[PDB]
Paper text:
In addition to SPL5, SAP05 can also target plant SPL13, another member of the SPL family that plays an important role in the juvenile-to-adult vegetative transition and the vegetative-to-reproductive transition. By X-ray crystallography, we also obtained the complex structure of SAP05 with SPL13, structural analysis indicated that it shares a conserved interaction pattern observed in the SAP05-SPL5 structure, highlighting the evolutionary conservation of SPL family recognition by SAP05.
SAP05 is an effector from a plant pathogenic phytoplasma that mediates the degradation of host transcription factors, including SPL and GATA family proteins, by hijacking the 26 S plant ubiquitin receptor RPN10 independently of substrate ubiquitination. Specifically, SAP05 folds into a tight globular structure consisting of a parallel five-stranded β-sheet (β1-β5). Although SAP05 carries a single domain, it utilizes two opposing surfaces (hereafter referred to as Lobe1 and Lobe2) to interact simultaneously with TFs and AtRPN10, forming a dumbbell-shaped structure, in which TFs and AtRPN10 have no direct surface contacts. In summary, SAP05 bridges the TFs mainly through electrostatic interactions with a hydrophobic core, whereas the SAP05-AtRPN10 interface comprises predominantly extensive hydrophobic contacts.
Author numbering:
A (entry chain C): 32 to 135
B (entry chain A): 37 to 135
C (entry chain D): 98 to 162
D (entry chain B): 99 to 162
Amino acid sequence: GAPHEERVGDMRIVNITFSDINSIKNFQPFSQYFDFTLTGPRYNGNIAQFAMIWKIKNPPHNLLGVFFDNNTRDDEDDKYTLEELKQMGNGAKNMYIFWQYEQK
Amino acid sequence: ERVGDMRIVNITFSDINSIKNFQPFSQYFDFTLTGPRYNGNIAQFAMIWKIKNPPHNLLGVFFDNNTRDDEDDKYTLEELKQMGNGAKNMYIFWQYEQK
Amino acid sequence: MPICLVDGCDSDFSNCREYHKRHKVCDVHSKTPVVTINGHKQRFCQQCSRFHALEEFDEGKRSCR
Amino acid sequence: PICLVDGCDSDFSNCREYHKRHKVCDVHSKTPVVTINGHKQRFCQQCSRFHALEEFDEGKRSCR
Ligand SMILES: [Zn+2]
Ligand SMILES: [Zn+2]
Ligand SMILES: [Zn+2]
Ligand SMILES: [Zn+2]
């Protein structure tokens, strides 16, 4: 990982930025976990194709999704915020957070 | 995160080709150059000055305003954080990795 | 082909995602502690995204031991 | 392509697209006094253009 990257316990937090959601469709090896038919950013409760389906609560407007690279966690819509999810790696060594770029 | 009135913005990308769809950054990059570069000014293709001893996966540095000393292999990334010279944002571009 | 393997489940997959279609279980039965497939008691393991017999799970666990 | 400076003996072999696009070679982009068509100029760092030498104060890389 990079010098500035946040860690929670032994889990690295990786914030990756895209021009928009359609760029992620070409991003292997992560595109296989997204579900591009869904509205609103999702996180995965487990590891499987299309597993990023659980609605993140009160998400930042440019957040596009969250992928934990291992282990399981409670799997519910509109229950966990992004900051709370950072505490729920439950053994994942990397938490990938996907963002839409915005100027300010 | 901040040096004076300048915000340090680390941005991580899926790959270098992705930067081409990023504006305003794409007009300042020169994708034919080897090794990460910083700009001494604001102009097309202005990111040309070789950063010294760059860290793994650093792709470049873009200062969003003003001018600074402009030399190859003279300033490390940490030194450049002190060289905003009035820029409000220093953008630091990184290649993501799986650790 | 959206299908749920659970005996008698006539789910329309209205509330289900591609995840559920790919793994042959509707949203309800992916979390039910006990389901029946062809007369056999199973549970849809969260870790594996597969059905297992109940004896592969410890007391009240979403995933096999 | 070429450098606007009088009699410039530079190939753009060792120059970047930035230099080529702004018609100045790497050396003359920082030279404090150059001549174009016989007139004293300096390549402004801020503007990335030549200006008359009179538009600069002493050693400044950029115009006033
Ligand atoms: Zn069912
Ligand atoms: Zn299992
Ligand atoms: Zn020249
Ligand atoms: Zn000027």
